[PDB]
Short mmCIF file of C-alpha atoms in Angstrom, two decimals:
data_model
loop_
_atom_site.label_atom_id
_atom_site.label_comp_id
_atom_site.label_asym_id
_atom_site.label_seq_id
_atom_site.Cartn_x
_atom_site.Cartn_y
_atom_site.Cartn_z
CA UNK A 1 39.20 -11.67 -19.86
CA UNK A 2 39.97 -8.56 -17.72
CA UNK A 3 36.69 -7.02 -16.30
CA UNK A 4 36.00 -3.56 -14.68
CA UNK A 5 32.61 -3.05 -12.80
CA UNK A 6 31.27 0.29 -12.32
CA UNK A 7 28.25 1.38 -10.32
CA UNK A 8 26.23 4.42 -11.17
CA UNK A 9 23.37 6.53 -10.20
CA UNK A 10 20.68 7.05 -13.18
CA UNK A 11 20.70 10.79 -13.40
CA UNK A 12 24.29 10.74 -14.23
CA UNK A 13 23.38 9.11 -17.54
CA UNK A 14 22.32 12.75 -18.58
CA UNK A 15 25.54 14.10 -17.63
CA UNK A 16 29.05 13.17 -18.76
CA UNK A 17 29.01 9.47 -17.91
CA UNK A 18 28.29 7.76 -21.11
CA UNK A 19 30.95 10.14 -22.87
CA UNK A 20 33.47 9.27 -20.17
CA UNK A 21 32.53 5.30 -20.49
CA UNK A 22 32.87 5.56 -24.35
CA UNK A 23 36.21 7.32 -24.52
CA UNK A 24 37.64 5.12 -21.62
CA UNK A 25 36.46 1.90 -23.87
CA UNK A 26 38.73 3.29 -26.52
CA UNK A 27 41.76 3.41 -24.22
CA UNK A 28 41.10 -0.32 -23.46
CA UNK A 29 39.74 -2.14 -26.50
CA UNK A 30 40.75 -5.26 -24.36
CA UNK A 31 38.63 -4.62 -21.59
CA UNK A 32 35.17 -5.89 -20.55
CA UNK A 33 33.17 -3.00 -19.01
CA UNK A 34 29.88 -4.02 -16.83
CA UNK A 35 27.76 -1.23 -15.87
CA UNK A 36 25.49 -1.36 -12.91
CA UNK A 37 22.66 1.10 -11.67
CA UNK A 38 22.83 1.33 -8.06
CA UNK A 39 22.45 3.80 -5.08
CA UNK A 40 25.39 5.08 -2.93
CA UNK A 41 24.50 2.46 -0.17
CA UNK A 42 24.57 -0.39 -2.62
CA UNK A 43 27.92 1.14 -4.13
CA UNK A 44 29.49 1.16 -0.76
CA UNK A 45 28.74 -2.61 -0.10
CA UNK A 46 29.81 -3.68 -3.66
CA UNK A 47 32.92 -1.60 -3.55
CA UNK A 48 33.92 -3.32 -0.11
CA UNK A 49 32.98 -6.69 -1.51
CA UNK A 50 34.93 -6.42 -4.75
CA UNK A 51 31.60 -6.51 -6.73
CA UNK A 52 32.28 -2.97 -8.37
CA UNK A 53 35.49 -1.27 -8.85
CA UNK A 54 34.24 2.40 -9.07
CA UNK A 55 31.16 4.03 -8.04
CA UNK A 56 29.64 7.18 -9.34
CA UNK A 57 27.11 8.84 -7.03
CA UNK A 58 25.48 12.03 -5.55
CA UNK A 59 25.45 11.32 -1.92
CA UNK A 60 28.58 11.36 0.54
CA UNK A 61 29.60 7.97 2.10
CA UNK A 62 30.37 7.65 5.79
CA UNK A 63 32.81 4.80 5.55
CA UNK A 64 36.62 4.58 6.22
CA UNK A 65 36.93 1.61 3.75
CA UNK A 66 35.96 3.94 0.90
CA UNK A 67 37.77 6.94 -0.90
CA UNK A 68 35.55 9.52 -2.45
CA UNK A 69 36.24 12.44 -4.34
CA UNK A 70 34.22 15.40 -5.57
CA UNK A 71 34.28 15.58 -9.28
CA UNK A 72 31.99 18.79 -9.81
CA UNK A 73 28.87 20.36 -8.22
CA UNK A 74 26.02 20.60 -10.87
CA UNK A 75 23.78 23.53 -10.84
CA UNK A 76 20.09 22.89 -10.01
CA UNK A 77 17.57 24.49 -12.40
CA UNK A 78 13.76 25.04 -12.17
CA UNK A 79 11.60 23.32 -14.69
CA UNK A 80 8.44 25.21 -15.50
CA UNK A 81 5.82 25.53 -17.93
CA UNK A 82 6.59 28.20 -20.59
CA UNK A 83 3.55 30.29 -19.46
CA UNK A 84 4.51 30.25 -15.68
CA UNK A 85 5.30 33.73 -14.41
CA UNK A 86 8.61 32.37 -13.30
CA UNK A 87 9.53 31.85 -16.99
CA UNK A 88 9.63 35.50 -17.46
CA UNK A 89 12.92 35.22 -15.68
CA UNK A 90 14.62 32.44 -17.78
CA UNK A 91 17.36 34.93 -18.85
CA UNK A 92 18.05 36.41 -15.27
CA UNK A 93 17.39 33.44 -13.10
CA UNK A 94 15.33 33.05 -9.73
CA UNK A 95 16.03 32.47 -6.12
CA UNK A 96 14.91 29.33 -4.02
CA UNK A 97 12.92 31.74 -1.85
CA UNK A 98 10.71 32.32 -5.10
CA UNK A 99 9.63 28.84 -5.16
CA UNK A 100 8.20 28.39 -1.51
CA UNK A 101 4.54 28.43 -2.53
CA UNK A 102 4.66 26.63 -5.81
CA UNK A 103 3.24 23.37 -6.18
CA UNK A 104 6.69 21.30 -6.34
CA UNK A 105 7.26 17.97 -7.89
CA UNK A 106 10.00 15.72 -6.25
CA UNK A 107 11.40 12.55 -7.65
CA UNK A 108 12.05 9.53 -7.45
CA UNK A 109 9.79 7.50 -5.44
CA UNK A 110 12.77 4.94 -4.97
CA UNK A 111 13.96 4.24 -1.36
CA UNK A 112 15.52 7.24 0.56
CA UNK A 113 17.62 9.24 0.76
CA UNK A 114 17.59 10.27 -2.74
CA UNK A 115 17.13 13.04 -5.02
CA UNK A 116 13.78 13.97 -3.45
CA UNK A 117 15.52 14.31 -0.03
CA UNK A 118 18.38 16.19 -1.74
CA UNK A 119 15.98 18.94 -3.00
CA UNK A 120 14.17 19.08 0.40
CA UNK A 121 17.67 19.50 2.13
CA UNK A 122 18.69 22.24 -0.28
CA UNK A 123 15.58 24.14 0.60
CA UNK A 124 16.16 23.28 4.45
CA UNK A 125 19.51 24.45 4.39
CA UNK A 126 18.29 27.96 3.10
CA UNK A 127 15.67 28.13 5.90
CA UNK A 128 12.84 27.18 3.55
CA UNK A 129 10.13 24.39 3.90
CA UNK A 130 7.86 24.37 0.91
CA UNK A 131 4.55 22.91 1.85
CA UNK A 132 2.95 22.15 -1.68
CA UNK A 133 4.99 19.15 -2.23
CA UNK A 134 4.05 16.15 -4.44
CA UNK A 135 6.39 13.09 -5.03
CA UNK A 136 6.37 11.52 -8.37
CA UNK A 137 7.93 8.34 -9.67
CA UNK A 138 10.70 9.41 -11.94
CA UNK A 139 12.36 12.23 -13.72
CA UNK A 140 10.25 12.02 -16.94
CA UNK A 141 7.02 12.13 -14.74
CA UNK A 142 8.11 15.32 -13.25
CA UNK A 143 9.03 16.81 -16.50
CA UNK A 144 5.85 15.56 -18.17
CA UNK A 145 3.65 16.77 -15.57
CA UNK A 146 5.41 20.23 -15.47
CA UNK A 147 4.66 20.53 -19.09
CA UNK A 148 1.30 19.46 -18.49
CA UNK A 149 0.68 22.48 -16.29
CA UNK A 150 0.88 20.38 -12.88
CA UNK A 151 3.39 22.70 -11.17
CA UNK A 152 7.14 23.17 -11.02
CA UNK A 153 10.26 20.94 -10.44
CA UNK A 154 13.83 21.25 -9.49
CA UNK A 155 16.35 19.38 -11.70
CA UNK A 156 20.07 19.10 -12.40
CA UNK A 157 21.24 21.15 -15.18
CA UNK A 158 21.97 18.14 -17.37
CA UNK A 159 18.19 17.25 -17.45
CA UNK A 160 18.01 19.82 -20.28
CA UNK A 161 18.85 16.70 -22.25
CA UNK A 162 15.05 16.44 -22.30
CA UNK A 163 13.23 19.08 -24.14
CA UNK A 164 9.37 19.00 -24.12
CA UNK A 165 7.06 21.27 -25.80
CA UNK A 166 6.31 24.34 -23.51
CA UNK A 167 8.78 23.01 -20.88
CA UNK A 168 11.27 25.51 -19.91
CA UNK A 169 14.43 25.55 -17.63
CA UNK A 170 15.07 28.64 -15.50
CA UNK A 171 18.59 28.92 -13.79
CA UNK A 172 18.71 29.39 -9.93
CA UNK A 173 20.65 32.17 -8.55
CA UNK A 174 21.51 30.67 -5.17
CA UNK A 175 25.36 29.74 -5.18
CA UNK A 176 24.57 26.53 -3.23
CA UNK A 177 21.59 25.38 -5.21
CA UNK A 178 23.87 22.49 -6.39
CA UNK A 179 23.88 18.64 -6.92
CA UNK A 180 27.18 17.14 -6.28
CA UNK A 181 28.84 14.33 -8.31
CA UNK A 182 31.40 12.04 -6.67
CA UNK A 183 33.39 9.15 -7.79
CA UNK A 184 33.93 6.44 -4.95
CA UNK A 185 36.62 3.71 -4.73
CA UNK A 186 38.22 1.38 -2.40
CA UNK A 187 40.25 3.31 0.03
CA UNK A 188 43.36 1.23 -1.04
CA UNK A 189 42.65 1.42 -4.74
CA UNK A 190 45.69 1.73 -7.12
CA UNK A 191 44.68 0.04 -10.30
CA UNK A 192 45.78 1.64 -13.63
CA UNK A 193 42.36 0.68 -14.90
CA UNK A 194 40.84 2.95 -12.39
CA UNK A 195 43.31 5.65 -12.77
CA UNK A 196 42.64 5.53 -16.55
CA UNK A 197 39.06 5.89 -15.69
CA UNK A 198 39.64 9.07 -13.44
CA UNK A 199 42.14 10.56 -16.04
CA UNK A 200 39.40 10.18 -18.80
CA UNK A 201 37.21 12.25 -16.50
CA UNK A 202 40.08 14.75 -16.36
CA UNK A 203 40.40 14.76 -20.00
CA UNK A 204 36.60 15.46 -20.73
CA UNK A 205 36.53 18.25 -17.94
CA UNK A 206 39.37 20.02 -19.52
CA UNK A 207 37.58 19.84 -23.12
CA UNK A 208 34.43 21.40 -21.35
CA UNK A 209 36.39 23.99 -19.29
CA UNK A 210 35.47 22.45 -15.81
CA UNK A 211 37.45 22.76 -12.79
CA UNK A 212 39.92 19.93 -13.01
CA UNK A 213 39.37 17.18 -10.28
CA UNK A 214 42.21 16.59 -7.64
CA UNK A 215 45.31 14.73 -8.65
CA UNK A 216 45.01 11.05 -8.39
CA UNK A 217 45.78 9.58 -4.95
CA UNK A 218 46.09 12.82 -3.05
CA UNK A 219 45.25 11.32 0.09
CA UNK A 220 48.44 9.51 -0.51
CA UNK A 221 50.22 12.61 -1.69
CA UNK B 1 -16.21 19.32 -6.87
CA UNK B 2 -16.03 17.41 -10.11
CA UNK B 3 -13.09 14.74 -10.84
CA UNK B 4 -11.94 13.48 -14.10
CA UNK B 5 -9.23 10.65 -13.58
CA UNK B 6 -6.67 9.83 -16.51
CA UNK B 7 -4.51 6.96 -16.77
CA UNK B 8 -1.53 6.94 -19.18
CA UNK B 9 1.86 5.24 -19.96
CA UNK B 10 5.06 7.08 -19.31
CA UNK B 11 6.24 7.13 -22.92
CA UNK B 12 3.41 9.18 -23.99
CA UNK B 13 4.85 12.10 -21.77
CA UNK B 14 7.49 12.71 -24.58
CA UNK B 15 4.58 12.97 -27.07
CA UNK B 16 1.56 15.09 -27.03
CA UNK B 17 -0.01 14.32 -23.62
CA UNK B 18 1.40 17.14 -21.77
CA UNK B 19 0.27 19.75 -24.40
CA UNK B 20 -3.34 17.96 -24.48
CA UNK B 21 -3.76 17.97 -20.68
CA UNK B 22 -2.69 21.67 -20.51
CA UNK B 23 -5.07 22.64 -23.21
CA UNK B 24 -8.00 20.62 -21.87
CA UNK B 25 -7.25 22.16 -18.45
CA UNK B 26 -8.14 25.67 -19.89
CA UNK B 27 -11.33 24.53 -21.38
CA UNK B 28 -12.29 23.40 -17.83
CA UNK B 29 -10.99 25.77 -15.22
CA UNK B 30 -13.46 24.26 -12.69
CA UNK B 31 -12.27 20.78 -13.14
CA UNK B 32 -10.04 18.65 -10.71
CA UNK B 33 -7.86 16.34 -12.88
CA UNK B 34 -6.10 13.62 -11.66
CA UNK B 35 -3.35 11.83 -13.63
CA UNK B 36 -2.10 8.18 -12.94
CA UNK B 37 0.75 6.41 -14.49
CA UNK B 38 -0.46 2.69 -15.30
CA UNK B 39 0.07 0.01 -18.01
CA UNK B 40 -2.54 -0.98 -20.28
CA UNK B 41 -3.72 -3.94 -18.13
CA UNK B 42 -4.10 -1.83 -14.99
CA UNK B 43 -5.98 0.79 -17.24
CA UNK B 44 -8.29 -1.87 -18.43
CA UNK B 45 -9.15 -2.89 -14.79
CA UNK B 46 -9.36 0.73 -13.55
CA UNK B 47 -11.79 1.60 -16.26
CA UNK B 48 -14.19 -1.17 -15.56
CA UNK B 49 -13.96 -0.31 -11.83
CA UNK B 50 -14.53 3.42 -12.32
CA UNK B 51 -11.21 4.25 -10.90
CA UNK B 52 -10.01 6.08 -14.08
CA UNK B 53 -12.17 7.61 -16.90
CA UNK B 54 -9.85 7.55 -19.73
CA UNK B 55 -6.64 5.67 -20.54
CA UNK B 56 -3.80 6.25 -22.80
CA UNK B 57 -1.62 3.65 -23.90
CA UNK B 58 0.09 1.57 -26.50
CA UNK B 59 -0.95 -2.13 -26.05
CA UNK B 60 -4.26 -3.52 -26.88
CA UNK B 61 -6.12 -5.50 -24.43
CA UNK B 62 -9.08 -7.65 -25.44
CA UNK B 63 -12.22 -6.64 -23.47
CA UNK B 64 -15.77 -6.39 -24.32
CA UNK B 65 -16.11 -3.91 -21.48
CA UNK B 66 -13.87 -1.31 -23.24
CA UNK B 67 -14.01 0.77 -26.29
CA UNK B 68 -10.43 1.58 -27.59
CA UNK B 69 -9.56 4.02 -30.42
CA UNK B 70 -6.43 4.24 -32.58
CA UNK B 71 -5.17 7.84 -32.30
CA UNK B 72 -1.97 7.57 -34.45
CA UNK B 73 0.74 5.40 -35.28
CA UNK B 74 4.14 6.49 -34.31
CA UNK B 75 7.31 5.66 -36.02
CA UNK B 76 9.78 3.28 -34.27
CA UNK B 77 13.51 4.55 -34.44
CA UNK B 78 16.64 2.73 -33.65
CA UNK B 79 18.82 4.60 -31.03
CA UNK B 80 22.66 4.11 -31.56
CA UNK B 81 25.94 5.43 -30.74
CA UNK B 82 27.13 8.15 -33.31
CA UNK B 83 30.01 5.80 -34.06
CA UNK B 84 27.91 2.68 -34.76
CA UNK B 85 28.06 1.09 -38.38
CA UNK B 86 24.31 1.72 -38.45
CA UNK B 87 24.64 5.39 -38.13
CA UNK B 88 26.16 5.42 -41.70
CA UNK B 89 22.64 5.12 -42.79
CA UNK B 90 21.17 7.91 -40.54
CA UNK B 91 19.65 9.59 -43.68
CA UNK B 92 18.69 6.31 -45.58
CA UNK B 93 17.23 4.37 -42.58
CA UNK B 94 17.59 0.73 -41.81
CA UNK B 95 15.51 -2.43 -41.53
CA UNK B 96 14.50 -4.54 -38.45
CA UNK B 97 16.51 -7.32 -39.97
CA UNK B 98 19.83 -5.44 -39.77
CA UNK B 99 19.21 -5.35 -35.88
CA UNK B 100 18.91 -9.08 -35.09
CA UNK B 101 22.63 -9.65 -33.98
CA UNK B 102 22.94 -6.39 -32.13
CA UNK B 103 22.93 -6.21 -28.40
CA UNK B 104 19.27 -4.77 -28.01
CA UNK B 105 18.36 -2.99 -24.80
CA UNK B 106 14.59 -3.16 -23.96
CA UNK B 107 12.59 -1.38 -21.45
CA UNK B 108 10.94 -0.65 -18.91
CA UNK B 109 10.83 -3.40 -16.28
CA UNK B 110 7.46 -2.42 -15.14
CA UNK B 111 4.60 -5.09 -15.31
CA UNK B 112 3.98 -6.83 -18.66
CA UNK B 113 2.66 -6.27 -21.31
CA UNK B 114 4.65 -3.13 -21.73
CA UNK B 115 6.78 -1.38 -24.41
CA UNK B 116 9.36 -4.31 -24.45
CA UNK B 117 6.83 -6.95 -25.10
CA UNK B 118 5.43 -4.49 -27.80
CA UNK B 119 9.01 -4.16 -29.30
CA UNK B 120 9.52 -7.99 -29.13
CA UNK B 121 6.02 -8.34 -30.86
CA UNK B 122 7.09 -6.11 -33.81
CA UNK B 123 10.05 -8.30 -34.55
CA UNK B 124 7.97 -11.34 -34.26
CA UNK B 125 5.50 -9.84 -36.73
CA UNK B 126 8.53 -9.64 -39.01
CA UNK B 127 9.73 -13.29 -38.66
CA UNK B 128 12.55 -12.33 -36.27
CA UNK B 129 13.82 -13.53 -32.96
CA UNK B 130 16.68 -11.28 -31.83
CA UNK B 131 18.67 -13.15 -28.94
CA UNK B 132 21.14 -10.47 -27.58
CA UNK B 133 18.11 -8.97 -25.53
CA UNK B 134 18.78 -7.12 -22.28
CA UNK B 135 15.79 -5.67 -20.36
CA UNK B 136 16.62 -2.30 -18.59
CA UNK B 137 15.01 -0.32 -16.07
CA UNK B 138 13.67 2.73 -17.94
CA UNK B 139 14.10 4.78 -21.11
CA UNK B 140 16.82 7.00 -19.52
CA UNK B 141 18.90 3.76 -18.71
CA UNK B 142 18.55 2.37 -22.20
CA UNK B 143 19.58 5.65 -24.18
CA UNK B 144 22.36 6.34 -21.66
CA UNK B 145 23.70 2.95 -22.03
CA UNK B 146 23.51 3.25 -25.76
CA UNK B 147 25.23 6.64 -25.54
CA UNK B 148 27.94 4.82 -23.35
CA UNK B 149 28.40 2.22 -26.31
CA UNK B 150 26.59 -0.75 -24.51
CA UNK B 151 24.25 -1.44 -27.38
CA UNK B 152 21.35 -0.30 -29.37
CA UNK B 153 17.67 0.48 -28.71
CA UNK B 154 14.37 0.65 -30.32
CA UNK B 155 12.24 3.60 -29.18
CA UNK B 156 9.02 5.68 -30.12
CA UNK B 157 9.76 8.70 -32.40
CA UNK B 158 8.59 11.17 -29.75
CA UNK B 159 11.41 9.77 -27.45
CA UNK B 160 13.78 11.90 -29.46
CA UNK B 161 12.88 14.54 -27.05
CA UNK B 162 15.94 13.12 -25.19
CA UNK B 163 19.15 14.20 -26.82
CA UNK B 164 22.42 12.84 -25.43
CA UNK B 165 26.05 13.45 -26.65
CA UNK B 166 26.82 11.00 -29.40
CA UNK B 167 23.38 9.57 -29.21
CA UNK B 168 21.92 9.20 -32.81
CA UNK B 169 18.36 8.15 -33.84
CA UNK B 170 17.84 6.06 -37.19
CA UNK B 171 14.72 5.80 -38.85
CA UNK B 172 13.17 2.04 -39.64
CA UNK B 173 12.28 1.42 -43.31
CA UNK B 174 9.84 -1.40 -42.30
CA UNK B 175 6.34 0.12 -42.97
CA UNK B 176 5.07 -1.52 -39.91
CA UNK B 177 7.96 -0.72 -37.51
CA UNK B 178 5.39 1.47 -35.72
CA UNK B 179 4.01 2.00 -32.09
CA UNK B 180 0.28 2.79 -31.79
CA UNK B 181 -1.25 5.23 -29.64
CA UNK B 182 -4.83 4.48 -28.28
CA UNK B 183 -7.44 6.09 -26.09
CA UNK B 184 -9.45 3.64 -24.01
CA UNK B 185 -12.77 4.37 -22.39
CA UNK B 186 -15.61 2.34 -20.83
CA UNK B 187 -17.74 0.87 -23.50
CA UNK B 188 -20.85 2.80 -22.60
CA UNK B 189 -18.83 6.21 -22.04
CA UNK B 190 -20.68 9.29 -23.36
CA UNK B 191 -19.69 12.09 -20.96
CA UNK B 192 -18.98 15.56 -22.32
CA UNK B 193 -15.82 15.76 -20.22
CA UNK B 194 -14.47 12.60 -22.27
CA UNK B 195 -15.94 14.12 -25.36
CA UNK B 196 -14.05 17.41 -24.62
CA UNK B 197 -10.81 15.50 -23.89
CA UNK B 198 -11.07 13.66 -27.24
CA UNK B 199 -11.84 16.83 -29.10
CA UNK B 200 -8.70 18.37 -27.61
CA UNK B 201 -6.78 15.71 -29.23
CA UNK B 202 -8.48 16.29 -32.44
CA UNK B 203 -7.49 19.89 -32.23
CA UNK B 204 -3.92 19.22 -31.44
CA UNK B 205 -3.87 16.81 -34.47
CA UNK B 206 -5.17 19.44 -36.94
CA UNK B 207 -2.40 22.02 -35.59
CA UNK B 208 0.07 19.35 -36.09
CA UNK B 209 -1.16 18.13 -39.50
CA UNK B 210 -1.76 14.45 -38.15
CA UNK B 211 -4.74 12.61 -39.90
CA UNK B 212 -7.82 13.33 -37.82
CA UNK B 213 -9.08 10.42 -35.38
CA UNK B 214 -12.46 8.97 -35.87
CA UNK B 215 -15.70 11.05 -35.28
CA UNK B 216 -16.88 10.78 -31.36
CA UNK B 217 -18.91 7.62 -30.81
CA UNK B 218 -17.93 6.22 -34.45
#
């Protein structure tokens, strides 16, 4: 009967999204939940046209008809082969500057902007421009190729959900080597169904010891 | 300037392929190795045109121009949310038959034949036709959606490289609930570079305790 539609970006499935959806589901055994993989652009259009009710994404939205909230900044990490000299630093962590001359694997090859433009922006923003750059189709290809000895990759920290033989994840010491997670809704959105979804996020975050996201409708208050 | 070109399907990246490529690489520090993601149909055509030299995949294609060798049969597993009734039998295992009325997420949505046609073939071989079928973009979408409570999925055993909160992998009891791994080469192929690649696979299999694949050139 009652339907809630949620747009999301693929990479978030490695993060807290599934847990959040599943807990949410329990709060509303009545509710039909439709999930759609879509980019930030498609999310913006859908939200405005009423085709989704909340969008989870990694890019900022330039549209007054949409209210967007930063949930958390996810740390970036470097995926490396176990035998890479950089892995000698797994416990300590490394700096973006240490990577400029490495063969770097970007992904995905979907339309842009995407995570590959994000990574390049992170570098750019730190005054860095890697030349040994190779764009690969999807996350599992980047990781597989890294494990194969083809180079290194920058990944969100939750990518550690994937463990491959001889694949290692090195922390980045740069404060701003991050990838943001946003919720986006219709500017005038007031529904308790969305409130509940947002409260579920707050609950999970508290369990995990993350900074709690802003209070519901703080542009109102 | 010597180049070896290798075709592979993505799902093998969770298996032994990377380790193999890396080890092969060290045996030939001279060699330029190119890796290309492509399905078994594309691999078949690329081999005949000389665009790739070896192909790794999961689906057979009937072609007199290609020599295909079975390396090993991988178990299929059912991916379920930890709360799913099926997870009650995590230790025991379940049958394909227990799954027909479940909402099953197939993947990927790349050109057919792919892994989803393989999965459907496996059901078909056991006299089964599940109807609550949903084709989804990639393995990460399927597993994520499962972890979110959207249904169940069938995966190759090596896909357990992906671990998500409350995602559980259940064994299948049907002896033939498997997904094979093949190497495919040109029929007349006898290059030492491909020999070396094949022997590299043999070496890893011996380390891992897998049954050794056939002798080079039968």
